[model samples]
Target: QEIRPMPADSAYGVVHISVCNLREEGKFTSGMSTQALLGMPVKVLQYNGWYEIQTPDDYTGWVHRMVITPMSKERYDEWNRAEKIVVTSHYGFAYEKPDESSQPVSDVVAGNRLKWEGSKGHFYQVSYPDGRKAYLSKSISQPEAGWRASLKQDVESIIETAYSMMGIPYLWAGTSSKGVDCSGLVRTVLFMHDIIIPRDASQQAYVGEHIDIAPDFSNVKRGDLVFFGRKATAERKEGISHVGIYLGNKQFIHALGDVHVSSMNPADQNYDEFNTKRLLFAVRFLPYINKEKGMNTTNKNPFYQ
Candidate 1:
């Protein structure tokens, strides 16, 4: 396959290690913008001591110099073609050896990717981009190819994935098992099922198929992404401050203070009066996943092999 220039400039790089933070500025005090997961391809647009990169999700931010390994477009392609593994466990440790008692190599979280080397009994040997190798439990991860192929563009699968993250604490600009923000939680859940979307609630509002409904939300269904915040007007554009996955019966789950479910119905005990009033509309992506041509076509997914 032909390798395309990431930024249409000379500088391009790939996230060679596990999860790393993309910050708003070069300094450590700067706020985090998003996270760059392992094996994610990025466009290195500029550099200070910290490099500015654009993630596959199209989020741009600065990362510490040590976190990113710069690569040419050719090298990026070579890495992209290698077999990889997605960390299936919410949190797990990579051992220096196959034995669980062995010294730890590093801590990893779900969505972290590692190159497949070989295997030993219940462990799979994996390699980091910087020549580091370790053994991860086979039970905690799945082959990227197989996992991608198994993803279903259905409401049941999406809701199940969203529910798995329940009780995880909310963190600003976080998108990992350690913590996650509102949009980050939604983005990560969808990502697990091989569906890639933009990184922010504002950006996400533009994705998938827009569902038009009366102000009463009479036609809302499970798995539809319900957006909240101020509506658009002539003076300014729509402000999408929050998002959640509708779970039917006027209930939806999202990361507010933490990952939990809230009801839109006033009579219900869990009604979220604040968000219910702010609810703008809902969108659906499952209907857009096609067997033929489209952004989320099955054949176009990297996980589907």
Candidate 2:
């Protein structure tokens, strides 16, 4: 039988950088849209000076050409078939050799994934989408299955993970441990728990079950998402600008100038009157996870496959 591959209608590609920034326009100075981690599959919509791509969450942006490598559908599928290993560490590096003294092939952070070729000593031989090969330490990573198994999407795990990121610098479009945006902070904590949500606070606000902030936020629980922005009026529309993880006790953790915890009560020294006055609502994603309620797991996200 002859081997003839079907022609592609649209191009397929994957993020090559540990954290590739997506921009609102195809220019170096354009505003950022979001970030795509390494090993994320994307649809290459078109190519101008920069490549326009659609992230798995349906967010579209112009990415630097070198940050994403376009390939055929067949190759993309072949990549999906490869065994995957995800970075579980907050920060790490892939080296040219199995030793730490060697030069770094790339900087890696939590949520980044690589193709697992094999292991040598305490390092795993991995490959990026661009066919770049390197060795990564075993201590900071886990096999996809084991990592998934280790995750517990409960108050303890979520809160611990969120707390672990305290003091990290806030960055626009950042979703890695190195930094995070408002939504990126929430997204990072969820990603550690193997859950995926939309890319922005506004989009995230629409998902999960709405929880009443009444009775002085008594209805919201730990791990709930708290949104802050303007309320709707007759001529104006509702606007969602920021998000944070509800920590209960009238407090929540979010990334402002930096990742931090703030209290809604005025008496608390950690009180954030700015965010408090503009609070819109809260949402609980924990209950509806693994269901068709907008939240998704890596096992459910087609791009992660």
Candidate 3:
């Protein structure tokens, strides 16, 4: 018998202080599979100027080498336990000076994280993992712990946040307010309420409580995730291609060509003839994951309790 040992370095890493695109391959032109917000910890598997890594969600992809800061386990743990801040605004900037009039350090989107360094007036003093310092408006960011506590996992609040993103343009692998894909819309809105789930539709379909409303859509409630695309047969596995939040009244908000509402019922003016025909099933996360557990859905958010 032969035994294999782990690599001496192991290539461990964490996302640097910006939102980065995780691509399907090691090149800029490769399709983006998902967005990796700042401070996201990943396990680096291979490298070639691009790192093949797995996000906390277990979603794997290649990211530009320069975007990640490789670390040893001790360094990774030190950074992991550090105080952090998360951007709460739809869009904004980290500035070189506390004044917004100063040159911007970096363009930040919601969910980006930064290392906390106390405050200065109405701005938050923050630092990037690379030691770069910047200032964020107090109005736009909150302490990571405080922000997690403020999240509400109820159906009403989740639906409200989902509706607020109405009409945002669709973008592949986008998880920001500026644009979103089908699963991205679902993930982002749920994330607002602090119910983080997997990154893709197929992976998301596996979490939460399965409602088993396959041939019927009547029992679906607001905030339930309605999945579309092909169903599995004995010869093949189920393939979930799209997902949306059920808004009751046979309607769902999803990002197809763009973020918009569509109906499952033919009587409605906005009936989604296409998705309706391909509806696979629905999953509800509220009952299975609640505020009692704090910001994250069970097994969905590695950072949350």
Candidate 4:
């Protein structure tokens, strides 16, 4: 593994190991008070040049990479067969085939988000919105999406725009380019394309059409809402906590501590480990709306049409 500058300008250095151990004192474990456990392989959450990892069961927070050896899934599986495998940055290596030495792929920055397909031991096969495919070292490559097909295109454009604000700090009630909160970020992105979403996650849940699970995630399509956090059952009817746009292929972007893309799988360690037990419920905001700007469901002036 190669050492690169941490993505944040304020950041000094980053962790650089594989299947490394994590201390409870890291960012992932921030609000939840806990101590470090020994012998647990750390899972990488986000990579800013350096790898930031977490625990396999998502039981704990992030760990640095200096303590573990970075290797591909084949290597990790070959050596350690732990049901839970941890990873770091250096998510991928460019191949020149057997004829040339492999080159390391660029580390994931705040801007470069990926769509995950599946994984081998320590390697995750990924693709970008443009259909580019590559293999990333699983240790550092965090899993990121799970969506109803209905929401793919809209979610992608929205997330791509959000990435533009990568360095922006977290703000409460922020709906502009300046500073943004969770709902604030989502609102701004949607508004850019003239699509109006409810102000917050909980409220937004009420705006879409209820959808029963579609076998194999194909029926969903692009531009749909993928809501998470426990459902409102007859016994408990107020669903709350967390929301995001679904960009098929098991990936979605939300206003996590910082605006970023994440895997939508509820069982995914990264999503589970975040301290917020996110549920997997989905909704579609506009049933018969057009995709073009100035012509969404929100615009209803017959004179203009």
Leading candidate by lDDT: 2
lDDT of 2 by residue, 135-237 (tens): 9899988778777777787888889999999999999888889899999998888887878788889888988788768966778888889999999999999
Task: Report the lDDT tens digits of candidate 3 across residue range 210-243.
Answer: 8877445577788888898888999998889899
Name the better of 2 and 3 by lDDT: 2
Query: Count of backbone clashes for each model?
Result: 0, 0, 0, 38
Question: What shift in Å separates residue 63 of candidate 3 from its native position after superposition?
Answer: 0.9
Q: Candidate 1 vs candidate 2: which has greater lDDT?
A: 2
Error of 4 at 174 (Å): 1.9
lDDT for model 1: 0.79
Give the Cα error of residue 273 in candidate 3, in Å.
0.8
Sort by lDDT, best first: what order? Answer: 2, 1, 3, 4
- The candidate with the higher lDDT, 2 or 4, is 2
Compute each candidate's TM-score over C-alphas.
0.90, 0.94, 0.88, 0.40
Model 4 CA lDDT for position 41 = 25
Order of models, best TM-score first: 2, 1, 3, 4
The number of the candidate with the highest TM-score is: 2
Tell me which residue pairs clash in candidate 2. none
